[PDB]
Structures are given as C-alpha cells and as structure tokens.
Amino acid sequence: PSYLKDDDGRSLILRGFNTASSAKSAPDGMPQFTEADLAREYADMGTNFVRFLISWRSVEPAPGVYDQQYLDRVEDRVGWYAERGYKVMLDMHQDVYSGAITPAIGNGAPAWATYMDGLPVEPQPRWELYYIQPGVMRAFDNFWNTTGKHPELVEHYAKAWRAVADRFADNDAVVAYDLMNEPFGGSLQGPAFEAGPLAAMYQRTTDAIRQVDQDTWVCVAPQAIGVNQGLPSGLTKIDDPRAGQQRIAYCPHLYPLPLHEGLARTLTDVTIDAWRANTAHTARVLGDVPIILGEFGLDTTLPGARDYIERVYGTAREMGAGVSYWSSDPGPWGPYLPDGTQTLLVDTLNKPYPRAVAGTPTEWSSTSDRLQLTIEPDAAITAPTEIYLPEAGFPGDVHVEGADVVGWDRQSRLLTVRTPADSGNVTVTVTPAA
Ligand SMILES: OC[C@H]1CNC[C@@H](O)[C@@H]1O[C@@H]1O[C@H](CO)[C@@H](O)[C@H](O)[C@H]1O
Ligand code: NA
Ligand code: NA
C-alpha cells in the first residue's frame, strides 16, 4: 500500500471521525462541535485525523462570490485540530444535492445552483429515496450538464474549490481535499457516470486547485450507490499537474446492505471482502494511490457491532488505509450519546497505533497493552516514528525493543522512537514498563 506523507516524509496512518453532520444545516456552516469536544475526543481516543465537512453553499453563496468570513470560521476550527496535532481532510459535503430541494432534507449546493425545473420532490419514508425523485434527479442532471442546459455548474464548483484551496494551501494541518461526498449521477449510473462527467469534474477541479495549491492531496470518490455496498467502480485515472509525484488519493465509503449476526453477518463479511478487492483495484487504476476509508459506521448498540467495527479497522490496517468514522455526532452511531456518555466506540477505537512512520509500515498490530510495527526503512527521513499509546494500557513508562526511545510524552500520549535505516526492515515492539 501507498501512504500520504507529512512534511518530514513520514507515512501517515490516519484515524479519526467525520465532524460533523450538524454542519449541514447550520446557518453559519459550522458543526455543533467545540474545542472542548475535540479535547475530549483526543483524551479518550487519541485520534489524529478529521474529515471536516464544508459546503459549497457556504463557500459560494452567490455566483462567483466567495464568503471569506465562512472560510475564516473553517480556518478557526482547523486551528483547533492543528494545535492537537491532527491532520485535516476538507470534505465538500452534500446529500441529495441541496437543502433547496424542498421549500431541510438535503444539503450542499447553494439554492442558485439548484435547478429542479419544477419537477416534484414528494415526501419519502427514508431520506435516501429523495435521490430518485424527479426534481432531485433533474438537479443532478443539470449539475452534470446531462441536460445540456448548465455547463457553468461544474465550472463554478471547480472555482469554489480553488477558493478553498487558496485559503488553505499554506495550512500545515490540512493534508487532503475530498472533492465530492458520495457522487450521485442522476439519470447516469455506473461507468457511464463515473468515467464520464464524474471523472471530468474531478479533473477540472484538480486542475483549478493546482492553480493555487500544489501539495495538498486531492481525494476522489467513486459513485456511492452500489460501490458503498461492495460493487465495482468504473472511475478512471485523474491527472495531477503538480511537479513531481502524483498526490491523488482514493476516498471510498463502506456501507454493507445488511446494516451483525446470522446470515446478515455472513453477507456483511463477504461485502467487506468484495469492497476490499474493488477498492484495491480502483486505487491501482488511479495510479497505485493511497486509500482513505472516508466513511463507515453503524448503530453501536446493534449486537455484533464491535466485531464489525474491529474487522473494518483490521481490514483498513492491512490495506494501509486511513479511516474517518461516520461520525462524531451525538447518538448511538457515535462515540458519545447526547448527554456525553461514552458508547462502545470509545474503548473499541482507543488502541495503540503508529501515527507517523519513518518509513513504510509493512505490518503492525496492537492490543490494549502492546504495539508491534515493522518498518521498511527510508534513510532520507530524519524525523522519529510517532506512536499513540493509551493511558489505560500504558499507565507509566514504556519498554521498547527494536528502537531507541527519543521521547515519551505521557500527557499528549505520543511516543517517539528512532530506528536504523541501513539494516533492512525493522520491527519495533512497545509494551508497558514493569
Ligand atoms: O447515512 C449515514 C451517512 C451516509 N454517508 C453520507 C452521510 O451524509 C450520511 O449521514 C446521514 O446523512 C443524512 C442526510 O444528510 C442525515 O439525515 C443523517 O443524520 C446522517 O447521519
Ligand atoms: Na434554484
Ligand atoms: Na497543508
């Protein structure tokens, strides 16, 4: 597998949340999430990544007019993450195109960019079914210019992304731009969509971003419907005009149909197998690119939920993938219920992991009181390998075999170690001091 790198050349293992669905409907575009909430997340789970939801409607409230005050607010939040050593992926998020689909249900595009052409959007028994209503299908068909009536819309979208990239190009905490949440093709579905207008929008948007930001990873998603459930994607390779190596990453989601017991469990387990095979294939098509599992999640109160979550994280580990869990929002899917009580997720996610590796991690494992990591060396890297150790299992000092301890910060929970680069692959084992 391939990895995103920090400025020191270290390979990043990214673990965090989507923050947050509450931003979708907020008039000011910000999630209901405070700096104290982040402090709690970090204290409880030691996360190092966030998929932070932004919106086209907040970036470009009128055609060609970008809201710099909104971008100030995003920058403020990014600062909270920066101060705690997080890396940030900005997600241009939408569901069902826009809030403007009913006079709320959807989110994303500004009202001026929403053209339903008078076609109906009647109430449906679940929100996903709004996607196939005449007015919503038309809004998407207009956006992709399948109708031929709105070539300007993708151009606006690309330049809205350029405005965001212009603000964040020099932001050391931002590592990735997730160009579009869960692309939906309207009347176009499958390869005709993914290899057609979807790939074309990604290329235009990448090109626009690269006018102002040469180094941030541009992350592209397949269409969500079908591919979320383990079907193959027809997405094609996107060119990165940056000087040097390509910085495109693949950001699919995973949402098995049965969602964890009985035949449902078997169906979900083979879905993971199919999803892995397909994800690996498309990551190759895109140029042997890094993978970020941009979303997966479920009601943690469902029997078998822990086994599912642990299998997904194990699969992500084997694939060298980052993970942003859906989501930090309060409720049974998230790490905390509305009153602040921890769900199953906290103890499940709160495990040792390597955050930034001085070399390519070839394999690793962890339990509550042990981490083992094998590193393919890179002599050019002078920064230490950085590892998270939970206080639960590591209440005092560390015992490290296979590396020299550089520092052990018992407050931030960051262990830094140094390994030789001229002795082949190195295995580092970390356990609690006696
Ligand atoms: O259904 C869970 C997520 C699937 N991937 C896209 C995410 O936006 C979804 O989050 C849900 O979105 C819905 C529409 O905005 C919203 O009503 C729910 O509260 C979200 O959990
Ligand atoms: Na409109
Ligand atoms: Na950056």
Short mmCIF file of C-alpha atoms and ligand atoms in Angstrom, two decimals:
data_model
loop_
_atom_site.label_atom_id
_atom_site.label_comp_id
_atom_site.label_asym_id
_atom_site.label_seq_id
_atom_site.Cartn_x
_atom_site.Cartn_y
_atom_site.Cartn_z
CA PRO A 1 0.00 0.00 0.00
CA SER A 2 0.83 3.68 -0.52
CA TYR A 3 0.56 6.40 2.14
CA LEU A 4 0.05 10.14 2.43
CA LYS A 5 3.19 11.76 3.88
CA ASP A 6 3.78 14.67 6.25
CA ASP A 7 6.36 17.40 5.53
CA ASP A 8 9.06 15.23 7.17
CA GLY A 9 8.36 12.41 4.67
CA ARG A 10 6.75 10.13 7.29
CA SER A 11 3.94 7.79 6.22
CA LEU A 12 0.64 8.73 7.89
CA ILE A 13 -1.77 6.27 9.49
CA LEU A 14 -4.89 8.37 9.83
CA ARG A 15 -7.56 7.66 12.47
CA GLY A 16 -10.47 9.91 13.28
CA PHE A 17 -14.05 10.99 12.69
CA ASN A 18 -16.28 12.84 10.33
CA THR A 19 -17.10 16.15 12.03
CA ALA A 20 -19.92 16.75 11.63
CA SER A 21 -23.37 16.11 10.17
CA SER A 22 -24.61 19.02 12.33
CA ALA A 23 -22.73 21.41 9.97
CA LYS A 24 -25.08 20.50 7.09
CA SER A 25 -28.00 22.61 8.38
CA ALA A 26 -26.11 25.23 10.43
CA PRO A 27 -26.78 28.73 9.04
CA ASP A 28 -23.08 29.64 9.56
CA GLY A 29 -21.90 26.31 8.08
CA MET A 30 -20.13 25.18 11.28
CA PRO A 31 -20.67 21.91 13.16
CA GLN A 32 -22.07 21.83 16.70
CA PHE A 33 -18.63 20.91 17.95
CA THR A 34 -16.42 22.92 20.29
CA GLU A 35 -12.73 22.99 21.13
CA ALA A 36 -13.64 21.26 24.42
CA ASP A 37 -15.36 18.49 22.41
CA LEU A 38 -12.13 18.00 20.44
CA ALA A 39 -10.14 17.91 23.69
CA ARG A 40 -12.46 15.14 24.91
CA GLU A 41 -12.14 13.16 21.67
CA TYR A 42 -8.35 13.36 21.83
CA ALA A 43 -8.19 12.49 25.52
CA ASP A 44 -10.48 9.47 25.09
CA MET A 45 -9.31 8.05 21.75
CA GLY A 46 -6.05 9.75 20.66
CA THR A 47 -7.29 10.42 17.14
CA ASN A 48 -5.04 12.21 14.60
CA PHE A 49 -7.38 12.82 11.64
CA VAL A 50 -10.67 14.51 10.81
CA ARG A 51 -12.86 14.55 7.72
CA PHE A 52 -14.20 18.06 8.29
CA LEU A 53 -17.46 18.88 6.49
CA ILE A 54 -17.60 22.07 4.44
CA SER A 55 -20.29 23.09 1.94
CA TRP A 56 -20.50 24.68 -1.48
CA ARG A 57 -23.47 26.79 -0.31
CA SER A 58 -21.26 28.32 2.41
CA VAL A 59 -18.22 28.82 0.14
CA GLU A 60 -20.13 30.35 -2.79
CA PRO A 61 -23.42 31.86 -1.52
CA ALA A 62 -23.84 33.77 -4.80
CA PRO A 63 -22.47 33.02 -8.28
CA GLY A 64 -18.76 33.97 -8.32
CA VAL A 65 -18.89 35.45 -4.80
CA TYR A 66 -16.84 33.58 -2.16
CA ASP A 67 -17.54 34.05 1.53
CA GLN A 68 -14.20 34.79 3.19
CA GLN A 69 -15.87 35.06 6.61
CA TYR A 70 -17.07 31.46 6.26
CA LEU A 71 -13.51 30.47 5.34
CA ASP A 72 -12.31 32.36 8.45
CA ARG A 73 -14.61 30.13 10.52
CA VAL A 74 -13.33 26.95 8.86
CA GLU A 75 -9.76 28.16 9.47
CA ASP A 76 -10.61 28.75 13.15
CA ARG A 77 -11.77 25.13 13.50
CA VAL A 78 -8.76 23.82 11.56
CA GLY A 79 -6.62 25.66 14.14
CA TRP A 80 -8.15 23.61 16.97
CA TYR A 81 -7.13 20.46 15.15
CA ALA A 82 -3.68 21.87 14.32
CA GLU A 83 -2.99 22.66 17.99
CA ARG A 84 -3.60 18.99 18.93
CA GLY A 85 -1.51 17.52 16.10
CA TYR A 86 -4.38 16.46 13.84
CA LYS A 87 -4.32 16.30 10.06
CA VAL A 88 -7.44 17.60 8.31
CA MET A 89 -9.29 16.48 5.19
CA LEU A 90 -11.78 19.10 3.99
CA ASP A 91 -14.91 17.40 2.57
CA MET A 92 -17.15 19.32 0.14
CA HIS A 93 -20.20 17.59 1.51
CA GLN A 94 -23.63 17.07 0.01
CA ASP A 95 -26.53 14.70 0.44
CA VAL A 96 -29.45 14.80 -2.01
CA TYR A 97 -27.78 17.78 -3.77
CA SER A 98 -29.01 20.72 -1.68
CA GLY A 99 -31.25 21.91 1.13
CA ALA A 100 -33.15 23.73 -1.65
CA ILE A 101 -34.83 20.51 -2.90
CA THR A 102 -37.90 21.23 -0.72
CA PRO A 103 -39.33 24.59 0.46
CA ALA A 104 -34.03 20.63 5.27
CA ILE A 105 -33.79 17.18 3.63
CA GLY A 106 -30.70 17.65 1.51
CA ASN A 107 -27.57 19.72 1.92
CA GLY A 108 -24.66 21.01 -0.13
CA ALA A 109 -25.23 23.17 -3.19
CA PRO A 110 -26.44 26.75 -2.92
CA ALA A 111 -30.02 27.49 -3.99
CA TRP A 112 -28.77 29.39 -7.07
CA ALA A 113 -27.06 26.20 -8.32
CA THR A 114 -30.17 24.04 -7.77
CA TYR A 115 -32.29 23.60 -10.92
CA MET A 116 -35.18 21.16 -10.45
CA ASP A 117 -37.16 22.77 -13.30
CA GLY A 118 -40.48 22.47 -11.43
CA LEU A 119 -40.28 18.67 -11.14
CA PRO A 120 -41.69 17.15 -7.94
CA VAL A 121 -39.89 16.09 -4.77
CA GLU A 122 -42.57 14.42 -2.66
CA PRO A 123 -42.04 13.14 0.92
CA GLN A 124 -40.36 9.73 1.16
CA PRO A 125 -40.20 7.16 4.00
CA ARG A 126 -36.38 7.38 4.20
CA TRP A 127 -34.03 10.19 3.19
CA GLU A 128 -32.01 8.19 0.63
CA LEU A 129 -35.15 7.79 -1.51
CA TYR A 130 -35.19 11.56 -2.13
CA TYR A 131 -32.26 10.96 -4.51
CA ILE A 132 -34.54 9.32 -7.10
CA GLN A 133 -37.36 11.90 -7.02
CA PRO A 134 -37.90 13.75 -10.33
CA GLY A 135 -36.77 17.17 -9.04
CA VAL A 136 -33.61 15.78 -7.45
CA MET A 137 -32.69 13.64 -10.47
CA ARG A 138 -33.10 16.80 -12.58
CA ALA A 139 -30.98 18.92 -10.19
CA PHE A 140 -28.19 16.37 -10.62
CA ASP A 141 -28.75 16.02 -14.38
CA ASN A 142 -28.42 19.82 -14.63
CA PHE A 143 -25.30 19.89 -12.44
CA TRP A 144 -23.53 17.22 -14.56
CA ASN A 145 -24.89 19.00 -17.68
CA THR A 146 -26.60 15.81 -18.85
CA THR A 147 -29.46 18.15 -19.84
CA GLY A 148 -27.08 20.38 -21.83
CA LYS A 149 -28.58 23.40 -20.05
CA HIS A 150 -25.95 24.14 -17.37
CA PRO A 151 -22.31 23.80 -18.48
CA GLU A 152 -21.46 26.54 -15.95
CA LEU A 153 -22.23 24.50 -12.82
CA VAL A 154 -19.15 22.22 -12.79
CA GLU A 155 -17.02 25.28 -13.67
CA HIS A 156 -18.40 27.11 -10.59
CA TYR A 157 -17.79 24.02 -8.46
CA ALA A 158 -14.13 23.79 -9.53
CA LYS A 159 -13.56 27.50 -8.83
CA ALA A 160 -15.30 27.26 -5.44
CA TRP A 161 -12.77 24.52 -4.61
CA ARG A 162 -9.97 26.78 -5.89
CA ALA A 163 -11.16 29.47 -3.41
CA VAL A 164 -10.97 26.96 -0.55
CA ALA A 165 -7.55 25.73 -1.70
CA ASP A 166 -6.28 29.33 -1.97
CA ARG A 167 -7.09 29.81 1.73
CA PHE A 168 -5.65 26.52 2.95
CA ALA A 169 -2.63 26.00 0.68
CA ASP A 170 -0.23 27.18 3.40
CA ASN A 171 -2.06 25.49 6.27
CA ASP A 172 0.24 22.86 7.78
CA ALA A 173 -2.68 20.91 9.35
CA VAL A 174 -4.60 20.35 6.09
CA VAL A 175 -3.44 17.25 4.17
CA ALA A 176 -6.35 16.45 1.85
CA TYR A 177 -9.32 17.80 -0.13
CA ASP A 178 -12.20 15.32 -0.59
CA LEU A 179 -13.71 16.78 -3.76
CA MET A 180 -17.28 15.50 -3.51
CA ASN A 181 -19.15 13.48 -0.91
CA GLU A 182 -20.99 10.47 -2.35
CA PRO A 183 -21.26 11.47 -6.01
CA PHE A 184 -24.69 10.72 -7.49
CA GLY A 185 -25.18 10.68 -11.25
CA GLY A 186 -28.95 11.16 -11.52
CA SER A 187 -30.07 9.54 -14.78
CA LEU A 188 -26.45 8.43 -15.38
CA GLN A 189 -25.27 5.46 -13.28
CA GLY A 190 -22.25 3.14 -13.34
CA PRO A 191 -19.21 3.59 -15.65
CA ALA A 192 -21.15 5.96 -17.96
CA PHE A 193 -21.33 8.31 -14.97
CA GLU A 194 -18.02 7.61 -13.23
CA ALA A 195 -15.80 7.61 -16.33
CA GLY A 196 -17.83 10.41 -17.93
CA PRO A 197 -18.89 13.58 -16.09
CA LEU A 198 -17.65 12.48 -12.65
CA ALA A 199 -14.06 11.95 -13.82
CA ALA A 200 -14.32 15.14 -15.91
CA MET A 201 -15.39 17.21 -12.88
CA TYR A 202 -12.58 15.72 -10.78
CA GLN A 203 -10.06 16.64 -13.48
CA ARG A 204 -11.35 20.21 -13.82
CA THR A 205 -11.45 20.65 -10.04
CA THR A 206 -7.97 19.15 -9.52
CA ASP A 207 -6.65 21.49 -12.21
CA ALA A 208 -8.33 24.50 -10.55
CA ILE A 209 -7.00 23.56 -7.11
CA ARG A 210 -3.50 23.13 -8.56
CA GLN A 211 -3.50 26.79 -9.70
CA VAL A 212 -3.16 27.76 -6.01
CA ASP A 213 -2.16 24.64 -4.02
CA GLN A 214 0.46 22.22 -5.33
CA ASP A 215 0.95 19.95 -2.29
CA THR A 216 -2.39 19.02 -0.70
CA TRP A 217 -3.67 15.55 -1.62
CA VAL A 218 -6.73 15.58 -3.84
CA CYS A 219 -9.05 12.78 -2.83
CA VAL A 220 -11.61 11.34 -5.23
CA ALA A 221 -14.59 9.08 -4.51
CA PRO A 222 -16.46 6.60 -6.68
CA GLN A 223 -20.21 6.97 -7.07
CA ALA A 224 -21.75 5.96 -3.73
CA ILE A 225 -24.77 3.92 -4.77
CA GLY A 226 -23.70 0.32 -5.35
CA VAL A 227 -20.00 0.92 -4.69
CA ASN A 228 -20.74 1.68 -0.98
CA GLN A 229 -22.30 -1.79 -0.88
CA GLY A 230 -19.32 -3.61 -2.44
CA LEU A 231 -19.86 -3.26 -6.21
CA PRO A 232 -17.01 -2.23 -8.52
CA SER A 233 -16.35 1.37 -9.56
CA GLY A 234 -15.77 2.50 -13.14
CA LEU A 235 -13.83 5.59 -12.05
CA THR A 236 -10.85 6.35 -14.28
CA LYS A 237 -7.41 7.88 -13.62
CA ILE A 238 -7.20 11.58 -12.73
CA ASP A 239 -4.12 13.54 -13.82
CA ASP A 240 -2.25 15.58 -11.24
CA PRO A 241 -0.47 18.54 -12.87
CA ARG A 242 1.80 19.11 -9.82
CA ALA A 243 5.55 18.93 -10.42
CA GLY A 244 6.87 15.62 -9.09
CA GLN A 245 4.87 12.61 -7.94
CA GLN A 246 1.07 12.49 -8.18
CA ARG A 247 -0.87 13.36 -4.99
CA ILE A 248 -4.28 11.83 -5.69
CA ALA A 249 -5.89 9.57 -3.09
CA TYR A 250 -8.97 7.34 -3.22
CA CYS A 251 -11.70 8.03 -0.62
CA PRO A 252 -14.49 5.41 -0.91
CA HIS A 253 -17.12 4.66 1.76
CA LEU A 254 -18.30 1.31 3.15
CA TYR A 255 -21.97 0.71 3.97
CA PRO A 256 -22.92 -3.01 3.77
CA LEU A 257 -26.55 -3.69 2.79
CA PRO A 258 -27.48 -5.88 5.79
CA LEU A 259 -26.65 -2.98 8.13
CA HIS A 260 -24.45 -8.19 12.67
CA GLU A 261 -25.43 -11.82 13.35
CA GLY A 262 -26.58 -14.95 11.49
CA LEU A 263 -26.85 -14.76 7.69
CA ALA A 264 -26.70 -10.94 7.90
CA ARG A 265 -23.21 -11.30 9.39
CA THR A 266 -22.09 -13.61 6.57
CA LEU A 267 -23.45 -11.15 3.99
CA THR A 268 -21.62 -8.25 5.68
CA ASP A 269 -18.36 -10.24 5.92
CA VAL A 270 -18.36 -11.09 2.19
CA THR A 271 -19.29 -7.44 1.45
CA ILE A 272 -16.06 -6.39 3.20
CA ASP A 273 -14.16 -8.92 1.04
CA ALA A 274 -15.73 -7.58 -2.18
CA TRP A 275 -15.25 -3.96 -1.07
CA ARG A 276 -11.57 -4.59 -0.32
CA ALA A 277 -10.94 -6.23 -3.72
CA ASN A 278 -12.72 -3.46 -5.61
CA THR A 279 -11.13 -0.64 -3.60
CA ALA A 280 -7.67 -2.08 -4.19
CA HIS A 281 -8.38 -2.35 -7.94
CA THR A 282 -9.55 1.25 -8.36
CA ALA A 283 -6.64 2.52 -6.21
CA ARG A 284 -4.40 0.80 -8.78
CA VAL A 285 -6.30 2.33 -11.72
CA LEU A 286 -5.81 5.80 -10.19
CA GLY A 287 -2.01 5.23 -10.07
CA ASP A 288 -1.34 2.95 -7.07
CA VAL A 289 -2.71 5.64 -4.79
CA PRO A 290 -3.27 5.88 -1.03
CA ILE A 291 -6.68 4.88 0.31
CA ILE A 292 -8.79 6.66 2.91
CA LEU A 293 -11.95 4.97 4.12
CA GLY A 294 -13.78 8.29 4.27
CA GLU A 295 -16.87 6.88 5.97
CA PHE A 296 -18.15 3.76 7.59
CA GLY A 297 -20.36 3.43 10.67
CA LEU A 298 -23.35 1.84 12.34
CA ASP A 299 -25.58 1.85 15.40
CA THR A 300 -23.10 0.60 18.03
CA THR A 301 -25.98 -0.81 20.10
CA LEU A 302 -26.64 -3.49 17.46
CA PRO A 303 -25.49 -6.96 18.52
CA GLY A 304 -22.21 -7.80 16.75
CA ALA A 305 -21.30 -4.13 16.20
CA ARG A 306 -17.90 -4.43 17.91
CA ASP A 307 -16.91 -7.41 15.75
CA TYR A 308 -17.89 -5.49 12.60
CA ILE A 309 -16.01 -2.36 13.67
CA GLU A 310 -12.91 -4.36 14.61
CA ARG A 311 -12.96 -6.25 11.28
CA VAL A 312 -13.25 -2.99 9.34
CA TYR A 313 -10.33 -1.41 11.23
CA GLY A 314 -8.27 -4.60 10.74
CA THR A 315 -9.06 -4.52 7.02
CA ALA A 316 -8.12 -0.81 6.86
CA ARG A 317 -4.84 -1.61 8.64
CA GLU A 318 -3.98 -4.39 6.15
CA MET A 319 -4.82 -2.08 3.22
CA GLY A 320 -2.73 0.80 4.62
CA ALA A 321 -5.90 2.90 4.67
CA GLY A 322 -6.83 5.91 6.73
CA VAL A 323 -10.24 5.92 8.43
CA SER A 324 -12.71 8.64 9.32
CA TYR A 325 -15.65 7.04 11.15
CA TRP A 326 -19.19 8.36 10.47
CA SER A 327 -19.47 10.29 12.72
CA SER A 328 -18.64 12.39 15.81
CA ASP A 329 -22.30 13.49 16.02
CA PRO A 330 -24.08 12.65 19.29
CA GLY A 331 -26.06 9.39 19.22
CA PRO A 332 -25.72 5.57 19.18
CA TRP A 333 -23.62 5.62 15.97
CA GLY A 334 -21.08 7.98 17.51
CA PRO A 335 -18.51 7.90 20.31
CA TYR A 336 -20.87 9.70 22.75
CA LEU A 337 -24.60 9.75 23.40
CA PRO A 338 -26.22 13.22 23.57
CA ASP A 339 -25.64 13.52 27.36
CA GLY A 340 -21.91 12.74 26.92
CA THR A 341 -21.99 9.07 27.94
CA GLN A 342 -19.42 7.02 26.00
CA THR A 343 -20.67 4.38 23.59
CA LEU A 344 -18.95 1.10 22.66
CA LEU A 345 -16.88 3.08 20.17
CA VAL A 346 -14.55 4.74 22.68
CA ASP A 347 -12.97 1.56 24.12
CA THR A 348 -13.06 -0.07 20.67
CA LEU A 349 -11.12 2.75 18.96
CA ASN A 350 -8.82 3.61 21.87
CA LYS A 351 -5.92 1.36 20.92
CA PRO A 352 -2.24 1.98 20.27
CA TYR A 353 -1.37 2.87 16.69
CA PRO A 354 1.52 4.35 14.72
CA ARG A 355 0.59 7.91 13.68
CA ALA A 356 3.54 8.91 11.50
CA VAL A 357 6.14 6.31 10.49
CA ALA A 358 9.74 6.98 9.44
CA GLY A 359 9.38 4.59 6.51
CA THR A 360 6.68 2.38 5.06
CA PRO A 361 4.81 0.34 7.63
CA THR A 362 4.74 -3.21 6.21
CA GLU A 363 2.65 -4.68 9.03
CA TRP A 364 1.56 -3.80 12.54
CA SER A 365 -0.68 -4.98 15.34
CA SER A 366 -1.92 -3.65 18.63
CA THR A 367 -3.83 -4.61 21.74
CA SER A 368 -4.68 -2.54 24.83
CA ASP A 369 -1.13 -3.03 26.21
CA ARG A 370 1.03 -3.84 23.18
CA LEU A 371 2.03 -2.44 19.81
CA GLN A 372 4.28 -4.08 17.23
CA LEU A 373 5.28 -2.37 13.99
CA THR A 374 7.55 -3.40 11.10
CA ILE A 375 9.11 -0.60 9.07
CA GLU A 376 10.67 -0.61 5.60
CA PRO A 377 13.42 1.96 6.15
CA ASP A 378 13.96 5.31 4.43
CA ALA A 379 17.34 6.90 5.20
CA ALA A 380 16.14 10.32 3.95
CA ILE A 381 13.72 10.63 6.89
CA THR A 382 15.25 12.25 9.97
CA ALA A 383 12.03 12.68 11.99
CA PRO A 384 11.20 9.93 14.52
CA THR A 385 8.39 7.43 14.25
CA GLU A 386 5.46 8.77 16.28
CA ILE A 387 3.08 6.41 18.09
CA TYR A 388 -0.07 6.83 20.21
CA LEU A 389 -0.24 4.81 23.45
CA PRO A 390 -3.44 4.86 25.57
CA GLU A 391 -3.01 5.53 29.30
CA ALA A 392 -5.30 2.60 30.13
CA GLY A 393 -2.67 0.08 29.00
CA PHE A 394 0.42 2.26 29.43
CA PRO A 395 -0.03 3.92 32.84
CA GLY A 396 3.68 4.75 33.32
CA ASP A 397 6.87 4.35 31.29
CA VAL A 398 7.41 2.27 28.14
CA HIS A 399 9.53 -0.74 27.27
CA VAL A 400 10.69 -0.61 23.65
CA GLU A 401 12.52 -3.34 21.74
CA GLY A 402 13.93 -2.75 18.25
CA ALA A 403 14.17 1.04 18.52
CA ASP A 404 15.64 3.82 20.66
CA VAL A 405 13.18 5.95 22.64
CA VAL A 406 13.50 9.61 21.62
CA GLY A 407 10.70 10.92 23.81
CA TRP A 408 7.69 9.69 25.72
CA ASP A 409 5.07 12.34 26.38
CA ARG A 410 2.69 10.96 28.99
CA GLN A 411 0.31 13.93 28.60
CA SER A 412 -0.06 14.01 24.80
CA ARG A 413 0.34 10.18 24.78
CA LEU A 414 2.93 10.42 21.98
CA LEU A 415 5.92 8.06 21.93
CA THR A 416 8.70 8.94 19.50
CA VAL A 417 11.31 6.35 18.54
CA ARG A 418 14.30 6.09 16.24
CA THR A 419 15.27 3.09 14.11
CA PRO A 420 18.25 2.31 11.85
CA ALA A 421 17.79 2.77 8.09
CA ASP A 422 20.70 0.56 6.89
CA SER A 423 19.73 -2.77 8.49
CA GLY A 424 16.70 -3.83 6.42
CA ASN A 425 13.15 -3.94 7.78
CA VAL A 426 12.96 -3.12 11.49
CA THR A 427 10.42 -4.49 13.97
CA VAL A 428 9.58 -2.28 16.96
CA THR A 429 7.69 -3.75 19.94
CA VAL A 430 6.23 -1.50 22.64
CA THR A 431 4.92 -2.78 25.99
CA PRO A 432 4.32 -1.21 29.42
CA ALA A 433 7.31 -0.80 31.74
CA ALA A 434 7.41 -3.32 34.60
O1 LIG B 1 -26.47 7.62 6.35
C1 LIG B 1 -25.24 7.92 7.03
C2 LIG B 1 -24.28 8.73 6.14
C3 LIG B 1 -24.02 8.03 4.81
N1 LIG B 1 -23.00 8.77 4.04
C4 LIG B 1 -23.36 10.18 3.82
C5 LIG B 1 -23.67 10.87 5.14
O2 LIG B 1 -24.04 12.22 4.89
C6 LIG B 1 -24.81 10.13 5.86
O3 LIG B 1 -25.17 10.81 7.07
C7 LIG B 1 -26.57 10.95 7.24
O4 LIG B 1 -26.99 11.94 6.29
C8 LIG B 1 -28.42 12.19 6.36
C9 LIG B 1 -28.73 13.20 5.28
O5 LIG B 1 -27.99 14.42 5.49
C10 LIG B 1 -28.79 12.75 7.74
O6 LIG B 1 -30.21 12.90 7.85
C11 LIG B 1 -28.31 11.81 8.85
O7 LIG B 1 -28.48 12.42 10.13
C12 LIG B 1 -26.83 11.49 8.65
O8 LIG B 1 -26.41 10.55 9.63
NA NA B 2 -32.63 27.34 -7.67
NA NA B 3 -1.27 21.58 4.11
#
